[model samples]
Target: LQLDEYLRQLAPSMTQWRRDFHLHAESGWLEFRTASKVADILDGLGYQLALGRDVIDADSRMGLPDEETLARAFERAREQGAPERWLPAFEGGFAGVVATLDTGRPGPTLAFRVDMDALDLCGHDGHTAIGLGLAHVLKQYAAQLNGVIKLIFQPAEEGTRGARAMVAAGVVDDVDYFTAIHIGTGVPAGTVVCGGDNFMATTKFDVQFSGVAAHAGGKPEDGRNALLAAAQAALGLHAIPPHSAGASRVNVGVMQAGTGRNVVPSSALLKVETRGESEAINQYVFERAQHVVAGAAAMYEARYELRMMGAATASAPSPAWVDYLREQAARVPGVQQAVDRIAAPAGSEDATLMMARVQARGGLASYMIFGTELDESVMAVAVETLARVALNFPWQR
Candidate 1:
């Protein structure tokens, strides 16, 4: 019945969960299979739960998929074997879960927030698997805890979208202590970061340029090439001078425009992003980007539109909490040495929105990093380390 051997014993099941989730991975709010499995497990564990619209405030959600995209994702999830019953609730890109364990005794309300969304790029497995393991640990040892524990499985974290809706829904409103985890950023597999700092404040934008189209060769003068305007805008965005106050980043990740080789492109779409060490600096860079987009469109005689897809403000760990976590993390068997600071500056996370909300309400919140080598054993280690941290919460006694 001892705590140390629990996750180790559960390692096989954890690995299966990780592999299954990976095989059925769907991005962001489209996580029907993932959410359903998580819900089924928590429900079996006797936790009070909320899902879909119950867990997300619709108006607060951002960067949502269009109807066509959502339909395709739903079909994909169904094809990949998402549960028939749970799939309907997540139909319109609505996916998230919040499970509450109420001890009904007087103690702090500790919250664990885990993102359930998959990245379109990389770094999905370790972190997502570890979160599920932590949930399992909480369920296995629910009798040993003295206070409330809320497990938040968030969606759409890739674009910094989901957390806002959850936060706006007041998920973390009454939380007293909050913690979250990420994997394989800067440290090696055995190293554990107790608390994180130096997160970048960032904004993601999707911009479009529109112009008149005409025959490429016969009436070239009559056409305003939107593609040329987009190219100029991309160049101008990268050329924006760095902020004197802090570091800034600007990138144009996607550009699509063109109908045929013989016809001028009347429209161009771009996916762009900007980041800064702080919110104000990020805003400065983004404003400059707006100007760049406008000027480029003007130069090419094209109209332009800018949409804010996602945003996040930089956040740091609570100083006292960081020190406390370092001590707790060091006691874990495989940790080399618990690092107080984040391994490196990181990109934006919508999790920061929830972290900030918790902090603003006078609660202690920290994000941790668990290094991984993409091995199954590392998954167990990650889960064990985080479980140890959660179990050691003062009220857990």
Candidate 2:
């Protein structure tokens, strides 16, 4: 098929897949159904198969194991007497997908990863197309593309931890160079934007305070209140200077302490996160968090434990790859051109794992941002733009 007509035929399907995955958005490790959907499509497309065998069922796919692990633990603890819905591990869907197409050509095994996960926040404000048969068509479309081209439809780009396990399982073993694309709303629609520094290495922090519980009216002053310690920690965490460690930002997003107002609570959990411009910054964040926990415990005479969640590495694309992609992107008639580098960067991806993996194997890695201009273009025609981006091929080095 010719490029234009091929792109035209593939348009609606891509949009369908994006929105379908969006509607059924699952977190990182919990992307079972999502992985099934992606693998199903890839298998149908004629790409050589490798499903459930390699992809390991991982913990929260997004954050550090320590923090994410504790978050899940705390949530489960809180749900001991509450409904299941309140449990942290209460997942709705599953994730993870890695399909390869070896052309048997004497060149680098180039990889393109498209993360298929959604945020836990209110991205789903109102009714959307996910229920209107769009998800199915997109799945079929992705499969068809697999049959014709070389790419992987990855699931779980959200805050779960799917990418690391995919890497550990040796999904990208033969890959000499890898590229990943993220669909973004912050930018205008259909614009193919590439960033030099696309994402930040984020570390999830989960801290807990444990102390003796006591009756508030009887011996409140004598009790070493864990809830009070957690509150103090949370407040101190919030008081941290913004960008204290080289663009390292901190946030105390969730806190649950206390059982009854008339009693001194025995324990409390704190959900915190730190993101920085580079991996080193995230490391600094880790050390700083320990100090906060130590200081808080001392203040309230309570003992504390800290757990680390997902530790996503930051990205700095190769100059050669960025130039090549930017040059290729500019040649497309309707495609938006990319700058030499990306500024005002945001978000994180498991593809960062691929980048690091490739580098470790002595290869090149690049993270490309394919603009899915939400609000700028109508929903129905948005997929067409993506098709144009995908089909507009250029020579590879």
Candidate 3:
């Protein structure tokens, strides 16, 4: 297998992988088959492998499916080609894969992450295939390369929770540089985007208020209206002040309250989200929103519980490092254009949390978009571009 020749030869396999993934798409945290396949491929390549418990902080996984759902997904994976050897490791909704390729030479460690869960979300299956191809391509350069490259196949990206779990488990603590790839977001096929701006930090949560139920006409004085508390919370959420730092957002997307028209509303629920240009600002909005919830609960003399369902931190990739990707993209065969930086108008991503972890540890990180027509050429180009970057990136010992 020679450079460009090898990529062309690998097209059929990549397309098959893409089709298979699409055919068996699974929801967030339920990517049992997907992770198993990912692990098997990397394991076969001789990379040190870890799945589920080894990679995810179990408690950090948000909005996990119920037990029956988890078991059904696991069984489905077992019946549908998930590698048997690694299937049991992700028994209880724990889903993800981590592969480490250490070349034995002393150099900086690099990480490449690809998300795999499909839940009203696309491009991830293709992203996983690109990851596999990247592994296949980089293995050919393993002997020539120095240091290590970590390949992270994350699940539950749809809810923006997987990366937080991985980060909490310390996946990027030792990374010197980190990178991620996405298939598309309106950019034309054949274009490669490097550096993304305005990555929105967001938090998804639920609030419930419970109060005493009583007859509205006869015993109205005995009833505590939880619906009023929820309405109050919604109003507070909408009233969240703008962040002095940058853009901020808050939305009370859903609200459910009351059981009957006559009886007092004893239970109320609100689904809400907060966002900002940065984590601190999102936190500001989230904190205020919480205070509002508690205040409303007290005002109505009801009990309340607020649970975080998902979250993603803001990110600003290394400007200089992004330039390096732009230059490298120009070299990838079939790539029509290499853009410097593109606005992240598509919205929040868990990958930002991974990127930020690396940055906080004094490493460089960036997220790129591999423009595609949802076809195989994009996969080949992605693999070639990432592998070339892996084989050529400058690493400090």
Residues 276-362, model 1: lDDT tens digits: 988899999999999999999998889999888888888877777777778888877778778677547467787888888999999
Error of 2 at 226 (Å): 1.3
Candidate RMSDs in order = 2.5, 7.3, 2.3
Between candidates 2 and 3, name the one with more favorable TM-score: 3
- Judged by lDDT, which candidate is best? 3
lDDT: the better of candidates 1 and 2: 1
Q: Candidate 2 on 372-392: residue-level lDDT in tens? A: 444422333323333333333
Q: Against the true structure, what is each candidate's TM-score?
A: 0.92, 0.75, 0.93
Residue 103, candidate 3: Cα error in Å is 1.1
Model 2 bad stretches (over 4 Å):
57-94, 121-150, 196-198, 214-218, 238-245, 372-397
lDDT of 2 at 275: 77
State the lDDT of candidate 3 residue by residue for 1-397, as single tens digits.
3778878777788888888888889889989998888788788889899789888998888877788989888999999988899988888977788899988898988899998888762545568888888888778768867888899999988878789999998888999889988887467788888886657999999898999754445477868889998998899889989988999999898899998998678999998889998889999999899899999999988999988899998879898789888888898877888977765464888899989889988999999888765445678888888888877776643
CA lDDT of each candidate? 0.81, 0.57, 0.85
